[PDB]
Amino acid sequence: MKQSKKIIITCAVTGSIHTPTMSPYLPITPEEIVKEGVAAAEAGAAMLHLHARDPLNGRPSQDPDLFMRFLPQLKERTDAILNITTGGGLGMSLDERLAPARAARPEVASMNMGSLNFNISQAAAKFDTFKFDWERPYLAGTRDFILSNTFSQIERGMTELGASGTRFEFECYDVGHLYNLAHFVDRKLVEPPFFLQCVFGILGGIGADPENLLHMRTIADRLFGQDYYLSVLAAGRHQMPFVTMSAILGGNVRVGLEDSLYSGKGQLATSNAEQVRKIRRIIEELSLDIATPDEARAMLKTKGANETSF
Amino acid sequence: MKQSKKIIITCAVTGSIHTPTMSPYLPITPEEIVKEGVAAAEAGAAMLHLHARDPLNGRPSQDPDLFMRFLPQLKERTDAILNITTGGGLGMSLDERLAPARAARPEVASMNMGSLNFNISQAAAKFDTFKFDWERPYLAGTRDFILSNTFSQIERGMTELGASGTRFEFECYDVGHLYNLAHFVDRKLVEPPFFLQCVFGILGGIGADPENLLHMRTIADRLFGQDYYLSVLAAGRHQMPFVTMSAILGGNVRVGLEDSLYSGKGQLATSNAEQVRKIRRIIEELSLDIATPDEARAMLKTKGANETSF
Amino acid sequence: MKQSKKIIITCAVTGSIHTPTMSPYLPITPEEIVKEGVAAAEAGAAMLHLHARDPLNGRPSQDPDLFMRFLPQLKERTDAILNITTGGGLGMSLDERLAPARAARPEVASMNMGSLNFNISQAAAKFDTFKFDWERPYLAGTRDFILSNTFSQIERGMTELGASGTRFEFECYDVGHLYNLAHFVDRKLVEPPFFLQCVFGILGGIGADPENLLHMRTIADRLFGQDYYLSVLAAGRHQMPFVTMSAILGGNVRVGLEDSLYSGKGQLATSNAEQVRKIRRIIEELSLDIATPDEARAMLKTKGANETSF
Amino acid sequence: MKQSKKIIITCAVTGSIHTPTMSPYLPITPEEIVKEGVAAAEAGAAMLHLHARDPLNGRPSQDPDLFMRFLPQLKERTDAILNITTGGGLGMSLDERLAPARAARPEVASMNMGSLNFNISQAAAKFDTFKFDWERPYLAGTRDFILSNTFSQIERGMTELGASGTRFEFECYDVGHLYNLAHFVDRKLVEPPFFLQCVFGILGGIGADPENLLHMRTIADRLFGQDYYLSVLAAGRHQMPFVTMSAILGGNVRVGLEDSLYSGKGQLATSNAEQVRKIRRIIEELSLDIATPDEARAMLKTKGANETSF
């Protein structure tokens, strides 16, 4: 693992797992996404991980037109690296999923490193009523859902998006995902540095037990040595302890309303900025420091803000 | 983990990953499966893990009629526990996959604990020619293949097969599979003892690095304490070191031509019995001992040989 | 490991490793020790780990008369649990080392769980001049020094101090110390709960690599299950990351000028209270909470503040 | 860790922990040591780890004259590398301990990497009577014993024995010993390759739990990368499982009556050769292979058999 002299704080603004019923502070409209992205960047986020939602009901959408209603606006108001999801909403085809990144030609895109069960159905039991008709069926339908990323699908994404100079945020939900990445690294379909994002607490993925983070770092060191950066995200209540653990291990951090709707125990976060501010305070207490957007670009070896199609 | 006073040697006779071109000793016909199963049992295998193949070309098949051409014969010639696959051939639907276990009502059935990429396409590069037309497309098609076991699919299998008194061999290909099992254990859809089979070396699953075995045991201890038995299988050259490691850790062992076509380095195994004999010799050198079929039945708490439908 | 609903912050006020030349803020006199202990307790320290020093030159001393110049004063000004060292100054005999605890009959005493090389000689290279004649020879002499705690010595300490109702802070500097404790636990010379203090970063002990903390917790879980509390201290720059890691793992924390002379990177701590305040802020950011002295007494099952001989 | 293409089998012939009462097959006289060393070498031992004993009563002795009654004889009858203990008998001074290696100028000498409690007193409870007067007091006296290896002592041994071209077998009884070695490696007092011998199961050292071996390998990889060879020994019943684990991990193996008096469960070993033969059979079952003495010399980079003073 390459030691992160300056820590990259990534903010995942809204995602596609949480639904409108779950929090009145979930960013939905393009205008809310811009406002939240800017606030997160101003709090210290060097990178913004972005999904789009239907502006009226919050349903996940990979419509590039919705992305074009916030990407240019974010670019004009902040210098944060704009990271586009290729995961999108649960149930979308690969064509739908790659559309935004293909249209935008971003500096960074997420790249899910394996197929797994992705079960968020238990969340539905916490709510007796739902604001929109799509929410309960969406959550319930995940009991029989696989977030698909076959070796052929990964290779296609790497080839098509790699061609425009995109660098990837490799999302690794389990130990096997590290080995899946090693397969591609050995075939030279991606070049170092590898930005490895370990994901904890999803039902279908690796659990949010600390031993799992240290284990994944040990395996990543064995497979990739000094050619990778560690980043960490964890679901809900696990977010702060896991990203603090990452900082301590010489890694990078991902926070945001996509991953947890809470600022702290029993308290809904009113903004992405609250979580960015919190992890930054923790980092500072540990005598560590954060990366600026341009320091992050140099770490990830991105193509530059001026080379995108927005 | 419950310490295995007597070690269960499971023999996986033929499987569905290896193809006829790869070895002339791959058991194909029902008569070959009976002969091999009996030899494996006589060498010390307490349990036989079974798949069927098209008798003419070796193509994987979950036709219950093919199973009925070897199950009664095995039952009459050995007292080994007959474990029926619910994985079957790669590309089969869940209906096809559950058919043999539903017809046979076996003491044990395999139960795959999560969805994963299952890529055996690299095997094709080792052979310039193939005996049968189905082999190359089968292997190549795995680049875009997911061995599907959604939470809904797992629950269906547990409910339908649990109803006939079947005990499961829980196949865990990655750390997330342990957490997937814990979900069901917490909901009481399966009762202890849990026979956990950790699977190493599949491209799409956890790699065959020793640290992965000890890590999975640590996590299983945290999730299940004294309610589980550890078993281990590893692909190809990793088979013997991994099953020896399992024995040393107080676990059980799985060998067989399903998992490795080799008796030792650079030597094709002429029979399943060769591998069973080898692991038994290693066990004996370590001052350990193997379980008889009935000792295995008492460990797994099976319904008994007389309660099956064959 | 028993989960620490409320975290015990222990403050090690001065120790015997750091010398006066190293910081003008090192507490030396009994009056400085009282002032510092009170400030640390008021900042949130539930327990104070105490050593004495020669009031004129700061040389470590296990003279019970020096302890009696701060113990009654601390008892009157705070309700913090007073933990007396049985380690004392490097080079002292066991008779000298046990004298303060034997005289004071404290609620808690430290108990070093094994013999190890204890080399602090490298610290001398950071200073071209020393305030007092004893400092350089003290540090240099540690190259050929063993902090002695033989099985006979440990048994004597446990027997003599156990007789007065003392509970022990078991100081474990390496993995073997856990096994040394297990030997005594199996012989029932100490009763649960076991307050295990893992010590990282001493040359001669286990290094300050995160993997070592998680490993020691895994081994402690195997040896002691639910009968122990985890506490952690780390030398110098490692203090804050290690105690934060402990908090995240469900453990307790030890800070203080005994272990690190710094408040943060490149900044000498002016008081023990600075470090207590810092770890408390980190704890609060993680949505965790600290234990009051009486909550700590209930956790450790101490004899009570009124049952000491001061 | 450097992968051991050929495995070095070291045979520790007699040691100083086991006493004559414990087995009639314990090698005592110089003639017995020669006979046993030759048998062990002929069974496959590339290296012989040697201690001397009083020929009449078996009491440990570091008298160089006793070593000269077996070293020339071993050199003439086998080409095995002769490894001389600098540990010797428990209770000896460093002067006594270094005498044999200083006189012999061997290719290899053992080098204990830290001070620890070394308690073998529990062995006495297994015997109601003892053959010789020295045995019970020797064992009982270990309750209050430290195997001393201070940083000054280690440096002296490295300097004095390094001067004659000796390579060291670094005996590491706990994780802290790895860090102790790193201190010397960083100061260039020893040059690569480092032959690291991890020692499990001594009361006062790290316990014989498998996790401890994998952990020590992880730490050694972090501290020394590709500059070291792993070797393993374990006490009594732990010997075979631990050395088999080492083989599986790409390490080397140490067996012998010094470490275990047993050939297998409930069976006293009649000769060192029995254990060498057993580990060699296990190695061969795993499709691994052993090193010849000269292959071992090339691995360890020894000065050659002709450059010793015997």
Ligand SMILES: [Zn+2]
């Ligand atoms: Zn996302």
Ligand SMILES: [Zn+2]
């Ligand atoms: Zn199968």
Ligand SMILES: [Zn+2]
């Ligand atoms: Zn202290």
Ligand SMILES: [Zn+2]
């Ligand atoms: Zn020895």
